[PDB]
Amino acid sequence: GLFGAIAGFIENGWEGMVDGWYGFRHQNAQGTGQAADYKSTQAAIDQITGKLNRIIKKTNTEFESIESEFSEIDHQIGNVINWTKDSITDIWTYQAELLVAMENQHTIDMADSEMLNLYERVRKQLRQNAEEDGKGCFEIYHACDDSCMESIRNNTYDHSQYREEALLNRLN
């Protein structure tokens, strides 16, 4: 994908995560956890809502009958009408095929971008206290308890608190 996050360096999605679109799994001494990210989930859903509002719509133009169902129309004007209607249908079929293809490409790449933007927000939070796994995980070079992990998710983690411990563990 464009941004490399989804069907990219993240090997697969989580059927387990049913309370949001994007989120975190952590492991520490104390055990395991899972939590959805609201802000990034709602960002993706709001953008898709916006598309549905624009696309699920008809024109308010009133159209009258020009062909009769129950009688012959003049053969010459009948052929003109048939040629026009077929031409208009070819345009609308093309526009519909292009609209949905283009919007599908955007929806997929937008969702990829929201995943990457969350990963980058966390990378910059952890600063020198962690290293990139390569598969969307961060190896944290200090004791990070469930209160520490919650601080990472809530964007309140202060790197300077654990920096000295972390740099020692990293340099080894």
Binding site: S68, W92, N104
Partner: protein
């Protein structure tokens, strides 16, 4: 040895295929349809002052065919024409038939106005036919008069009748010309002299010759009554110069405002609403496209040549 925090996204076991710019078979977590395939075989007429003509053809309400007795006047915002609707009890055709029908179906009502026409004691104006039955007995079109002399075969007098439009809006006047099947029946109604119908207004002028020739029976009649029509402007008069063969109007018609004209076979449902209709029924979808019919009327989804177009409403589905 070091604690880990992993980032990730949702997935589902049963994903949906959608088309993108680059990939025909792209699996995503959710999608919704943009093309309506489902139809309602009913005419959703809630919030609509509708009129179902049923057996009555729209042209029939101007001339007053027996079938159209209930539909001679009224106001509507929607008018429904059915298949094999009876325009004329008596066999015949209307000049610019399709132009007139389209005009009536566009309208939102019909008012009738008396022409006031009176006839001498030598003429009988109660002449009827077996083609147009009403109240068990022979009758005629309610808005026209067939009148003949007391002597069958006698030459029809060269009479002149004039209708004036006293109203502030244009009036639609219809008359008929009888075309006999043989020379015998041409002589009995209008006489031996050659028949000529002249119509004249400020904006309209035309001559009509009654054609006499053998032809097949329709509703058990070889004779034909072709209808003609024109608009009479406010304050203007229309003058009929005839020596027999002219079927004169008792009343003229006035079309009121605008309405939606539906040609369908589907039954009426007054519970559901719709703004889109076709031969097969109504289309109530919020969706922007449809593949039911290219012939639709009202505010409608656009017709496309596609079974389905799935719009992704979720990210790529990558399962474990």
């Amino acid at each position: 040895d070091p604690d880990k925090i992993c980032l990730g996204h949702h997935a589902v076991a049963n994903g949906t295929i959608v088309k993108t710019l680059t990939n025909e078979q792209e699996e995503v977590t959710n999608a919704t349809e943009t093309v309506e395939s489902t139809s309602l075989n009913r005419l959703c007429m809630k919030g609509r002052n509708h009129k179902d003509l049923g057996n009555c053809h729209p042209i029939g309400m101007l001339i007053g065919t027996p079938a159209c007795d209930l539909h001679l006047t009224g106001t509507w915002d929607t008018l429904i024409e059915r298949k094999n609707a009876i325009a004329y009890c008596y066999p015949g055709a209307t000049v610019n038939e399709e132009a007139l029908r389209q005009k009536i179906m566009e309208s939102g009502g019909i008012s009738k106005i008396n022409t006031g026409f009176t006839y001498g004691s030598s003429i009988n104006s109660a002449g009827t036919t077996k083609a147009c039955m009403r109240n068990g007995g022979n009758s005629f079109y309610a808005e026209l008069k067939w009148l003949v002399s007391k002597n069958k075969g006698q030459n029809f007098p060269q009479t002149t009748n004039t209708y004036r439009n006293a109203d502030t809006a244009e009036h639609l006047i219809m008359w008929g010309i009888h075309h006999p099947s043989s020379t015998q029946e041409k002589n009995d109604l209008y006489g031996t002299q050659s028949l000529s119908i002249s119509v004249g207004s400020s904006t309209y002028k035309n001559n009509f010759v009654p054609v006499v020739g053998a032809r097949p029976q329709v509703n058990g009649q070889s004779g034909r009554i072709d209808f003609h029509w024109t608009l009479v402007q406010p304050g203007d008069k229309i003058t009929f110069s005839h020596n027999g063969g002219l079927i004169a109007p008792s009343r003229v018609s006035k079309l009121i405002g605008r309405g939606l004209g539906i040609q369908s076979e589907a039954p009426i449902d007054n519970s559901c609403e719709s703004k889109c209709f076709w031969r097969g029924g109504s289309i109530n979808t919020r969706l922007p496209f449809q593949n039911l019919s290219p012939r639709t009327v009202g505010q409608c989804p656009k017709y496309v040549n596609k079974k389905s177009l799935m719009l992704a409403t979720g990210m790529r589905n990558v399962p474990e």
